[PDB]
Amino acid sequence: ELTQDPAVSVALGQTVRVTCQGDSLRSYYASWYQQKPGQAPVLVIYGKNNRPSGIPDRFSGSSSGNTASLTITGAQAEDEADYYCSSRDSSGNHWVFGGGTELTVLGQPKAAPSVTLFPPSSEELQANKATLVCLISDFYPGAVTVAWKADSSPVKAGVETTTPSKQSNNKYAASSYLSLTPEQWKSHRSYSCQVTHEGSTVEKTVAPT
């Protein structure tokens, strides 16, 4: 079995070290995989400090006893990802993976959410449904909540909202959907999507008009 720290942070431009430990590392060299959200893993280091084609020399590896370490110098925002160690098992028959280390690169600027609110489409209204779509992107840190208003009144029913998910640029995305009847949609002066981020609120409004 292979063990890693679940998480590690590093300041922008600085050096970070990810460690791996297990008895199989006495027999084989650890290899390291980088994985970003929604993407397949990528090999970055294997054997005695070998880098595959196209992996920058900021990445390096070392081994000692039943431990191995991945070192990333001059950490870039782009290095933010999960890092997995792996090796053949002591038998040399199968492959084993560590649980992965979440690497966070710090120093990222505060960023307000970009919010886009769409009313129901003509096409959807024609099909006798109405969905308001509130799309929230590029905010940091990755904590928001979303709420809805009809005119100036809070609306909690028919709401479906995601928890934040990390984007490829290390900012975050979220979305919320409000379901109405066409009659409801037509009845009010406006509907609002209201996004709360770091003690600030972003409210976008749409109107059947």
Added chain:
Amino acid sequence: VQLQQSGAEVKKPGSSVRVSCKASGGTFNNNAINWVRQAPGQGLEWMGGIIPMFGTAKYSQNFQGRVAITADESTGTASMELSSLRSEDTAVYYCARSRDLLLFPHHALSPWGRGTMVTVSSASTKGPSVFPLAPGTAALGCLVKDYFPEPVTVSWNSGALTSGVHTFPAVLQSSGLYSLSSVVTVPSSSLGTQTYICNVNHKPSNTKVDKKVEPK
């Protein structure tokens, strides 16, 4: 040397799924093809591997008895069959090459395929409804509403348009169905004149739909 994988699937508990890994060059030569899966939000787990040149395979004991890997060296294709499926088998399944053991003792897993999402569920498959989200810059999009299971893919203008595209992670509704949206940010000067079309694909329902997104 690249690996191509078969498309997303959904299977009921108790059934079986076959996932393909194809070598771009037509051959696996000397190499092993390994199968590694990843349940949503979790880590990597090796399932087994095969050396197609000899057909020799080894399996993780977590699956022995209900996993089988085979290969067709002539078409450069390898397949993993996972049977007696359970809900917990819901995962993205990757193939990854390893080189010959004795000649490359210290090498690892590379390259990796893009992954195949397999959902194991007794819930009914449901294709999405697709609606246009009508528009310095302006945002326009497509709503992909009420489908099951994951995944859905969205491209714009048949893949010609990639800059400024953001396809959001799906929401899992309280109903148990999913919805997602894809938006592109474009110059407002273009709205009169440039055609914008979202291409929505949902393999489990055999949905392939285009929607032109116009100003209202």
